[PDB]
C-alpha cells in the first residue's frame, strides 16, 4: 500500500531532519482508494473521557466563541470553549445558555419587567402597549408537534409554558433541522467548554463555570509548563472529579510530561502560531506547528492523552495535516472569526463546518483511510508517506 | 561528454536528496553541440500504440479544449483531449467534428432548414432572401484543384458536393497551408482524445465517444489509484480493444503499479500543480511536479508505459525539464488558454505550437541531444547533469 | 528540564550545521516556570569593569545618541555612546552634560550674556525686558526639599544657587521620578560612552573626551581587526588606565583574538547587519548576526571579555536571542531612532526601555531562567534547546 | 590569519555542498588589515597576453558598448567590447575610432563636403555661411602646449593640422585630464575588443575588425561548446596569430576543456544570469553564477586561461565575489547601461569606474589582501573563509 520503488519519507524521517516544520512545508502522498468519502468516520477524542463526532473545536477568543458559537459548534459535531475576557458571572451565564439549549425553545425569555410574559399569569404584547393581558398557556411536556399545532390554531408565535406557576419557556418552527452529530453529555445536554487562568483569583470563576455545568475546562496560557498551572490542575482534579481538564499550551514533550504527571485529560499544543494580541506578543520562544504537534503527540499517546492542534489552521488541508501528525482534534480561531455565530454586531457554522467535514473526509479518502484513527495509525507504523517542499513553494 | 573535473548532480542524486522538487528548483547543465536545432527529432509516444511528431497535448478543461483546439493541436503535431463538462451528446459531437476534418471542406454545413443548401437540390442564398434557388454542384471526388477552379469560374465561395442525392460538403482557399507533422490515424483522420469519469453513468458517454471514433480516452481524476478507475480500465480494455486508455492522475510509483497491472496504455502525472477549481480544491495530498514525473516515469518505463507530465507548465523550459525527467509528453492547460482556438467568445495555435517546437529543439541542442529519446537516455545513464538552486532564485 | 523524548537542537548543533544564521532563522524552545517575570535579574557586564542593571545600550549614530539619549539611557539602567559626527569640542561637551546631570538641576543655565542670571549678582527676567534685577539666591547644599519649598514661597520657577560668587545652578519639580536602575560611576555620576576613530588625529578627540570624564570608549570601525586599531588600543590602555575600551566591529573569533591580546575590555560584534550609510556601504564581507554573536562570544568568554550584539535588533525577541547566544549586552540604533530623546527637531525612553525590560524578563521566564547569566549558562551546557526554521517563515 | 576556533567554510567546502550558488547566497569572512585601501593592486589578466590595471570590462550589448564606452572604459583601466548588432562596416568603424583616439584631437573631423575644413586648403565657417575661407594651419608634431597656445593667440577653437596636403586633425583643452591606468597596446593606442558570431558569414566581419586593429575578439554565444565555435577558434588562431580570442559562454569545466584544447586565450563564463532578450530566452539550461565561475576557474587556471565573470553583477560586492571565486575580470552590462557613454540619445564612466575601483580596493582590504591575485590565492589555499546564507536573506 505504501510503495513499490522509492516513495517519499516516513513521518519519523521527515520530522527528524534538522528543521522544524510548518503545515505548508510538506505534503502527504496519496494512497489506494476502495471506498467513498461519505464512509469516512471522523470520530475524535477531545480528552480522555469526551468524544466528538468531528475533530473541530472553536477557540476561546472574544472575537470567536460565546454562547452563539458554542451551541452551533456543538450541534454540528464539535465543541466551543467560551472565552474568559469578561466577568466570571458573564462567562458562567454563557455556559448556562449552552447547557439549557433545545431547539423549539427560546434560549432567554424576557419574563415580565415592571411579546413578554407576566408573573415572574399574563402578557405585555406590542398591541396592549401601542397594561397587561390574560395569555393562554400549555402544559409542561407538550412536544413541538403538540405545541406548533396549538400555536397554528390560535395564530401565535410564542407559547408560554407552565406547570407550577413559573414560566419555563416555544417558538416558530415548521421545518426544524436535525442534528445527528450533536455533541451531548450523559443527560442529553449540549457539551460546553470554557477557558480560565491559573491564579488564585481564578478559583472563583472555576466555581461558577462548574455550577453552570461546564464539561471541559482549558487552562489558558502561552506557556503551560509552570508550577502555577500544575498546582491548578491538581486542585481541579481534586475538587471537581467530573470535570475534564486540558493543559496550558506546550510545544515540547518535556513540557507535556509535567502536565500529564499532574493529571491533565488533554493538551493544547501551539506557541508562536495563530493570532496575536498586544497583551501577548511573541518573543524568542515558540515552535513551528507541524513539528510541535508531531513531537508532543508522539509522547502523549503513550499515556492516552489526546492533543489539540491549536493555531495556524487556514484551510482543510491544514486540518488534515494536523490530525495525520497525531493531534486528536484541531482548535480554530480566525478561520471561524468570520462566521455568523461569531461575536460582534463566510456564513453560518451550520453551512461551514459541514463543508470542513466533507473536506476532511475527502482528505482521508485520498490517502486511503476510512477514519482519522486509521490515519494516525498509518503514520506511526511508517506506512503513511510525506514529501518535503523547498522553501520556495511552487505547488 | 559529461565532465572532466566535478560537474553537477545526476538525476538519481538530485531526486534522492530529501526534498521534492519543482521545475523551478533546478537547471540542466549544457553539453556539447555538433548539430543544428532544426535537426532535433521530437517524436514522442503518447501511449503504447500512439506516436506523435511533437510531445504537446492540450488539457481537457472547458476553457481549453473543444473541437477547435483539438483540430489545431492535431494539425501541428500534437493532440487535444475534449473536456467532459457537457452532455455526452455534445462531447461526442465535438469528437466527430475533429475526426471528419479535412482542409478545403466546411466542418459543419447548415444544410437547409425549412448560403445554405437545400434537399437535406437547391439553395437559400442571401439574395433570394433580401424562396429557394437551383444551385450548381460538383461530382464527388473532385480535388481542391478541380474545385477551387470550378468555383473561380462561376464566381462563388461554397461548392455544394453531391453523388447520391445527399449533400456531402468546399470553400475559399488560394494558398492552403501544409501540415507535415499532422497527427493522423490509420485511416488518415486527425487523432482525437476525450476525458471521462469512472462512474457507471460514464459508460454511456464512453459508448458515444467510441462510436464517434475517439482514439484515446483519459480517465479524469484527481487521484486515479482506486478500485473504481481500475475496474473502469478493465472494462474498456475488454469492451473496446482498439481504444487506448490513459490512467487517472497519480504521483507515486505505488499508484502507478495498480493502474499498470490493470492495463493502462499511459499515465497522467500530477497532483497539486496546475490550475484549480472550487469543485476540486487541493488538500493535504499532492507532490512537487518535478519529483512526481521522475519517480513515476522511472517505474513506468520498466513496463513500456508512457507518461504525461500534467500541470505547472508555464514556459518552454518547463516542458524540456518535464521531458528530460522521463515524461514522454506534456499536458498544457492555462498556457494554451489564451490562444485563438480556445473556447470562449497570444494568437493561434498555428503560430504558438511551432514556437514551442523550436524552443524544445533548442533546449535539446544546448544539452547535445539529437532527440527527446536520446535526452531521457542521457539522464537515466547518468550522463545528463543538473544543478539544484537555493530557495531564493537569483538566476 | 531539557526534555524526555527528542527535543530540538543544542546551540552547538544548530550553529554547526552549514549555514550562518540570522535572528529570524530560529526559535528558542520553552522550559519550566516556577517564578514570576518580575523576579528575573537582567544585570549585565558592559565591559570587564562596568556592570549595568539592564543589557541595553544605544548606538553612536548621529540620529540616535547625544546628551539627551545618553542621560535617559543611563537613568533607566543602560548606557549610551555619543556619536562622533561632530567636532571634538562638541562631542566632549555632550559627555560633560551627561556627567554633570542630577535631577532638579538645570543642565545648562544661560548665565548672563551682555530668566537668566547675572554675574557670570542679578537677573534679566522677561519682565524687566518687556536693565537687570537684584535676584534672591539659596546656599549651596540646599536639598530639593529645601529648595522646592523656598521656591513655592517666593512663587518662582528657577532658584539661582550660590556659595563662592559664581552661579552653580534648581527648577520645577513636584513629583520627581525615582531611578533605581540608574547607571552611575564610583562618584555617583551617570555613566557615559563615546565613539572615536583610530587615526592619529583621533588622539586629540580622545583627550577631550577623557578630560570630560568619559567612562567607556568604543573604537568605531566596520572592520576592527587592524594594526591601526590594535595600536590605538595599546595606546589608550597605556595613557588612560582608568578608561575602558571596546574594540572595533568583528564577526570571527580570529579577529577577536588580536584585539583581546591587545587588551580590549569588550568587543562590539556585527558586520552587514544594522543600518547603512553611503559613506560605508556593505560589500562582500560580513556575517549573519546570530552566528556572529555565538562564534565570537564562545571564544571571548574564555578570556572574560563581554560582547555587544550590535545591529539587526528590531524586537524584544531579537534582544533575547542575542543574549541567549552569548552576548552580554545589545546595541540598538534604529529601534531607538524614533524616541523623544533621539536627536532631531514611539515616545520617551522612560516608557520604552521599561517596556523592553519587561519583555526580556518574560523571555527569560518562558525558558525558565531567573537571570540572563543562567540563560547563557543553560545554552553553553547544552540544556537550552533551539529549533531551526525553513527559509519560508510560517510561524 | 584564517581563524583560531571554528571559522566558516573554505571555498572547496562551500561549493561542494549540494546546491549551486548565486552571488547573494554567501558572504566572505573578513581578515587582518595592515595596509591602506589605496595600496591594493587591481592588475588583472584579460586573456593570456593582455593585462589591464583594473578587472572591469563592458559588455558587447547595443545598449552598452560602442566607441564612446570603449574609449572611456579603456582610459580608466578597463576595456570595452563593441557589440555586433550592426553591419560589419559600422562595427569596424567603431573600433577604428577607439584605436585612433588621443586627447586633444577631434575623433572624427567633418572634412569638407561640397567649422569644417576644406581640401579633402580652406574652411567653411558658420560666419561665411551666415563660399569658403583661407584658414591657418599648424605643422604636424605640434604638442597640445604648442597648439593650445597657437589657438589662444588667434582666438580659435579648432586647429587644422597639416604636413603633406591632407587634414590629419586639435580642440579646446585648458585642464586636460591624466589617465595613469589607461589600457594601451604596444603602440600606445587604446585597447579595443569586439564581438562576433561563429558562422562562415562572420569571417568577413572578423576580417574588417582585424584590419581596423582590434586587439581582442569574443565569440558571442549562449552556449560556446560547439564544433562551430571550436572550428572558428582554430581558424582565427591560424589566420590571425596576433589576435587574442575569448571563447563562447560556458558554465562547466567539460565545456571549458574543448575550447581550451582548441586554443582560446580566455573564457567568458555565464548562462542564465544577466540581461535577457526575446531573441535569446532562457530555457532549461544554465547555472547559478557563483558556482559557475568557481568550477570553471578552478579548471581553467590549470592551463593559465583567464576567466571573465559575465552576468549578474549589480554591485561592487558582486564584483569582489566573482574575483575571489577565481574570475580574472568581470563583464558588466546593465550596471553600465545608465552611464553617459552608453549608446542612446548615473553619470560618466570617468566618475563611476573610479568609484568601483575604490570599492574593490576596500573589498580587498577588509579580507586582508594587497591584490586581487593574493585574494584568489588565499581562496585556493583554503585560507579565505566564507559563510552561506539561508534562502531568506536577513543581513
Ligand atoms: O486559528 P488561529 O487564529 O491561527 O489561532 C487561534 C489560537 O491563536 C492564539 N491567540 C489568540 N489571541 C491571542 C493573543 N495572544 C496570544 N495568542 C493568541 C490562541 O492560542 C488561539 O487558540
Ligand atoms: O497547465 P496548467 O493550467 O498549470 O495545469 C492544467 C492541469 O490542471 C488540472 N486542473 C484544471 N482545472 C482543475 C480543477 N480542479 C482540479 N484540477 C484542475 C488538470 O490536471 C489539468 O490537466
Ligand atoms: O540597530 P540597527 O539600526 O539595526 O543597527 C545600528 C548599528 O548599525 C551600524 N551603522 C549605522 N550607520 C551606519 C553607516 N555605515 C555602516 N554602519 C552603520 C552600526 O554598527 C550601529 O551600531
Ligand atoms: O551585467 P548584466 O546585464 O546582468 O549581464 C550582461 C550579460 O547578459 C547577457 N545578455 C544580454 N542581452 C542578452 C540577450 N540574450 C541573452 N543574453 C543577453 C550577456 O551574456 C552579457 O554580457
Curated annotation (Swiss-Prot), chains A, B, C, D:
IMP binds at residues 275, 310-312, 333-334. Keywords: CBS domain, Cytoplasm, Disease variant, DNA-binding, GMP biosynthesis, Leber congenital amaurosis, Metal-binding, Methylation, NAD, Nucleus, Oxidoreductase, Phosphoprotein, Potassium, Purine biosynthesis, Repeat, Retinitis pigmentosa, RNA-binding. Changing residue 270 to D: Does not alter the enzymatic affinity of the corresponding enzyme; does not affect the affinity for single-stranded nucleic acid. NAD(+) binds at residues 220-222, 270-272. GO terms for cellular component: azurophil granule lumen; cytoplasm; cytosol; extracellular region; ficolin-1-rich granule lumen; nucleus; secretory granule lumen. InterPro entries: Aldolase_TIM, CBS_dom, IMP_DH, IMP_DH/GMP_Rdtase_CS, IMP_DH_GMPRt. The modification Phosphoserine is found at residue 126. PROSITE patterns: CBS (PS51371), IMP_DH_GMP_RED (PS00487). It is an enzyme of class 1 (oxidoreductase). Changing residue 148 to K: In LCA11; does not alter the enzymatic affinity of the corresponding enzyme; alters the affinity and/or the specificity of single-stranded nucleic acid. Its cofactor is K(+). It is found in: Cytoplasm; Nucleus. The keyword Ribonucleoprotein does not apply. Because IMPDH activity is tightly linked with cell proliferation, it has been recognized as a target for cancer and viral chemotherapy and as a target for immunosuppressive drugs. The activities of the antitumor drug tiazofurin, the antiviral drug ribavirin, and the immunosuppressive drugs mizoribine and mycophenolic acid (MPA) are attributed to the inhibition of IMPDH. In addition, bacterial and parasitic IMPDH's differ significantly from mammalian enzymes, which makes it a suitable target for anti-infective drugs. It is linked to Retinitis pigmentosa 10: A retinal dystrophy belonging to the group of pigmentary retinopathies. Retinitis pigmentosa is characterized by retinal pigment deposits visible on fundus examination and primary loss of rod photoreceptor cells followed by secondary loss of cone photoreceptors. Patients typically have night vision blindness and loss of midperipheral visual field. As their condition progresses, they lose their far peripheral visual field and eventually central vision as well. This is Inosine-5'-monophosphate dehydrogenase 1. The gene is IMPDH1.
